[model samples]
Target: TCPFYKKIPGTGFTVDAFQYGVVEGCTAYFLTHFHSDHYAGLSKHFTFPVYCSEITGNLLKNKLHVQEQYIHPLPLDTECIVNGVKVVLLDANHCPGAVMILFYLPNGTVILHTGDFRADPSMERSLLADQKVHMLYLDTTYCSPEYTFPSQQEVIRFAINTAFEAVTLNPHALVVCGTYSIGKEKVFLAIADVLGSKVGMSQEKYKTLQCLNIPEINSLITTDMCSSLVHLLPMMQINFKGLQSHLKKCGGKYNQILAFRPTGWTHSNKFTRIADVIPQTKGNISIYGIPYSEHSSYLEMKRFVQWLKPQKIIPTVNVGTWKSRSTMEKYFREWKLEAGY
Candidate 1:
C-alpha cells in the first residue's frame, strides 16, 4: 500500500488500508466505518483480523458480506487487548458506524487514527482528551484554510427550518431528502421529524439502517411510498432533471418538489445564508445544497490537532507525493507551536 493508506508507525496494524489488499508487515486490520472508500478491499478475501466498533462489525458481516470469523467488534470507551496491544474505539460522530481508533504499542507509543469524522466538541472532555499521542493519523479531508463551514448542528437546523417553511407554504409539495449509503442521516431525520412527516426509502437502504444502534429511526422509515410525503433518495437524484421526472412519474401526486441535497462540497465548502444563493430552482423543483458535512472542516481540524498537541502527524488523504504532503505538512509545525510547545 502507498503512504496515503494510513499505517500506524512503529506497529503492524493497518487503519482503513484494505484498498491496497495486503500491505507489507501487516498483522492486524482496522476499520473506522462502513463507508465504501474506507472499506474498499474488505471482503471474504481478508486473511487478517479486523477490529472496529460493534455497529461497523455488524455492517461488514451483513452488508459487505465479510466473513464473520475474522470480525472483532469492540465496545466503545472500553480498552481491549488485541494481538497483545491495547486498542480503544470511540464514537466518531461522523456516521452511524464510524469510530476513532486509538492504539497503544508495547514500546509506550500512542497513536490516534481518525478515519473520517465531524468535529465533536464533547471530545474535549471524553477519553481522548487525556491522550499523549505520539502520532496522529489525521483525516485531513479538508486540510486547507479555505475550507470553512458551520457546525453540523447548525447546518442540520438550517435544513430543518428551510424545509419546514417550504412545506408549510405548499402542503402537497414532495420533500425529498438526499443522502449517500450511510451519511447525512441527521439532516433527513431531523427534517422529517420537525415537519411531522415519515421517511420512505428502498428496502435495501431501509435494511442498512437496521445495522445502526440509533433509536427511533426504524419507526420513521416507511415502505409504502404514498404513506410518506418525505422520501429519502440518493444524492445523485436530487438534480433538477431528476426531481422533475420523479414528480412527473407520480402523475400529479406531488404538485412541486423540494429536495434537500446536503454535502460538504457546496462550492469551496463555504456557505452563505441567502435564499437566492442557497436554492437552485427549476420549473417545479428547488434543490438546496446544504453545507452539511460528515468530515471535519479546516478550522475544526485545526482546533482538534491543537487541543491534542500530538508529537507528530501523518497525513492520511491528499498526501501521496511530497508536493501534496508539504501542503498538509505546512500546518503541523504551527499546530504544535500554537499549543505552546
Candidate 2:
C-alpha cells in the first residue's frame, strides 16, 4: 500500500489512485473523498471512468471541474457491479462526501477500503461484523498505541465550551476556530450556534459551505466582518503566530483573541482528560489545540480489526518505511490471534 491506495494488487479497479503514470490493469478509477491527498493527481484530461459518491460527484464537478462524462456517482449502500465486481459505498465518518468502499470480488473475496475514517459505534455496530472480510485496507493513520483520542462529540463540546468561556472572561475577545476545507464543520457550526454569533469568512469558503447544504449553514456565514463575532479559518492558521497575524490584520476593536485548533495530533498519547484542556497563551492571543480527529484512534482501529478478523491486513497510511510497516504487523498478529482466527 505504498502508493495507489494499495491499488488492489491485481485488479483494474483502483480506488483513489491518481498518482504515477499508467499501470497495466488501470481500468476503473475510484475516489473515496475530496481530500487533496486522496484525490490528488487527478486532472482535467483523463479517459478512465471515475467512481465516487453523489456528494463527491458534486465536489469533483463543482470544485475540481472534472468532466461529468467520466464521473459516475455510486449510490451508497447499494451494490452495483462495475467491471463485473460488486461495489458498495458505505457512509464514511471521515468527513462529508467521504465514503468507505466495499468491493466484492468474483472469488468471494470481500475487500474494504476505509479511505480515512474514524470508528464510531453507531456507524460500525454491525454491517460487516457478521460477514468474513477477506482483506481490510485499513485507515491506519493512527495505528500505534500512543495515539489515543476522545470522541468527536466530546471534542466538539470542548471546543464550544472553550470558546464560550474565553469570550465570557473577556467580552471583546474575538473567537476563531480552525477547520479543514470539508471536515470539522461541526465545531464551527456548534460555536456559532452556542455563542449565538454570526460567522465571518471569504466568499470562497462561504460558497463551498453552500455546496454541503447543511441546515442554517448559509445564514451563519456573513460577508461583513463587523457583523460577526466568530470567524472560521483553515487549520494552518490556528497556531499562536498565525493567530497573532490574523488579530493584527484586523481592526483593534478586540484587544484579545481566542482561537481553537481542532486536531488529533494534540492528544498526549495517554489519557487526555476532558477537564485538562489547557490553552497556550502569549500576550493577546490564546490558542487551544483540541484532539478533534476524523481519523480512527489506535484503540478504535484495534477494535475494528479485531471485530472483522479479516484474512489479510493492509495498512493504508504511514507505510512508507520499513520500521513503520514492520511495527504494524505485531498488532495484526495479536488481533488475529486474539480473535481466534
Candidate 3:
C-alpha cells in the first residue's frame, strides 16, 4: 500500500509527516497544521528539519519540546525555495496558522495540498484563479454526499442566539460551550461578545487563545467555572457522560447546565439544509450540536474542484482510488464553466 504522504516526482520535498519506512530518506518535510494526526510520531527526538507555520513552530518548540534548530517557520502567503522546488504558502482558512502548500515541481507540474481547509470563496479568487493544477491533494473528510453542513458564519449565529436565549431563560444555568483545543475560537469569542461576559477556558486553551491574538475576544478568561457565567469547555466535555461527571463535581451548585457543541457532526439526517437552531436536552443538561466545521462539505468540495479543474485528485485520507475519483468526476461534469478563465 502507498503511504498517505506523497512525494512529487523529480522533487526533493515531501508533504506532511513521513512514514517510518521512508522517513530517513526524504530530502525535506512540510507540515500543514499542528493537528496530531498530521504530525503523528513527530517528537523532540526526531532528527530532521521540519518546515511549518510560525504558530506550529512555537508549539513544536514550547509544547512538544522539539529541538530549536530542527524547526523552520514559514510565513503565510509567501513564496520561497526549499530543496530546489518553488513553494508558496496560502492561508487554509481552517484554523489559525493553517496553510495550503503549493509546490512547483521541476517537471513543471503544479501540485496543491489543501491541508484540511474550508473552501473560502475569497481564497479561490485570490490565489487559485487561472492556475493549472496538475495534482490536487484534497481534504476528503466530508467527501460523501451524506455530510451536509451550513456555513461557519451561520452556525456561529445560531449558536450565539441559542446560548443567549438559554442563559436568559435560566440565570442559574451554566452555559458550557464545547470546542476543540484550537479550531472553534470563533464560536467561543462570538458567544462571549454577545453575552457580555468572559469565556472561561482550561489553562491549555487560555494559552492557545493568547497565542491566536484574536481581536474580538475581549471577555475575561478564568479557570474557575463559578467565576464566569459562560464557560468554554473542551469539545469532549459536552457529551452526556462528561456533562454528568462535571455537574456532579460541581456538587449541584448550579440549578441547570446547558451544553453547546459547535461542530459539523451535530446533524445526521439527510436534509439538504438544516434549521439554524436544533437542541437536545435531558433533565438539567441541554446539548446543541451546531454545524461549524473547518473542513469543506461535499458541496463546497465539489465547487472547489470544479473551479480548480486539477488533472488528478488525490485523497488525503485512506480512500479507494476508483470511488474517490469517480465521485470527483461526477461533480466535475456537473460544474458549468463561467465567463473568462
Candidate 4:
C-alpha cells in the first residue's frame, strides 16, 4: 500500500492501480497505459471502475473483454473530475495509447504519474508551464549513467534508413522485424508506409491494431503470411530458431531472410556496454539492433526530475522490493543534487 497503492488524502483513487490477488480494496482505479505489468489483475470480472485514455479503454473492452460500463475514457490534454479530484491525461509518448496522469488533490497538492514514457519536450511546455508538482511518480527504467542513447526521432530516422538499405541490398530476402507485443508498431508501420508495401502481422497483433480503428493502419494491415515482403513478428519470434523455422517453411520461395531488432539496448562502448547496429551475418540470417526506445535515459530522467523539483520522488518500478528503497534514495538524491537544481 505504500507505493503501488496510494490513496489520495480524502478521496480514494489509486494510480497505476492493481488488485494483487483475487480480492483487495480500491475505490477507483486509474491506468496510465495498457502494458500488462501496469494493467495486471484486471479481467472481465473486475468490479471497480477503470479510467484510462480512449484508446486504452477500447483495448480493454475489445481485447480483454472488460464490460463497457466499468471502462471510462479520459481524453488526452483535457481535464476531468473523478470523485471530486481534478484529473488530466497527457500523451505519454511511450506507445500509441499510453498517457501520463496529472492529479490535482483537493488540498492543492499536484501529483504527476509519468506512467511509462520518455520525457518529451512537449510535456515540459504543457505540464510544467503553469502547474507546480508536489510528488513525482517517475518511470526510472534506466536510472544509471550507463545508458546514454540518442533521441527517439534520430533513432527512428536511422532505423527507417537502415531498413530501406537492408531491403535494397537483398530484394529477394524476407525481412522479419522484431517488435514488442503492443509498443513499437510504429517501426513496422513506417517501413510499410514508406516502402508502399503491405505489412503482415500475426492474428493477435492484427486484432490489437484493428481495435484502434485508425484508417492509416487499417489500410496497411494484413493477416496473410506471405502477402508482403516485410513481416512484423513478435520480439520472441525473431530469434535464431524462430528464423530457422520460418525459413524452413518459406525458404523455398525466398532466397534469404533478414531480421531487424529495433531497440535501444544496442549502444557499444566501454562506458556504454551495448553494441550499435551490427551487420554480422549468421548463415542466411542477418540481424541488426536499432536504438529506438520509449523510456527516458539516465540523463533525460535527471533533467526531467530537476525541472519538476518534487519534494518526494516515488519510483514506479521495484516499489515493493526491500533493498530498492536505499538504491532509489541514492538516485533521487543524485538527481536533485547532481542535476544542478
Cα deviation of 161, candidate 4, in Å: 2.3
**Model 2: ten consecutive residues of lowest lDDT:** 1-10
Off by over 4 Å in 3: 1-5, 19-24, 216-220, 251-253, 266-269, 318-341
TM-score of each: 0.93, 0.92, 0.88, 0.90
List residue ranges in candidate 1 displaced over 4 A.
2-5, 268-271, 274-277
Model 1: residue 221 alpha-carbon error in angstroms:
0.6
**lDDT of each prediction vs. the true structure?**
0.81, 0.80, 0.75, 0.76
What's model 4's TM-score? 0.90
lDDT of 4 by residue, 236-307 (tens): 877778888887776487777777787665446224323344555878787766667889887787777887
Tell me how far the alpha carbon of residue 133 in candidate 4 is from the true structure, in angstroms, after superposition.
0.8
Q: For model 2, name the residue pairs that clash.
A: none
Best by lDDT: 1
Highest-TM-score candidate: 1
- TM-score order of candidates, best first? 1, 2, 4, 3
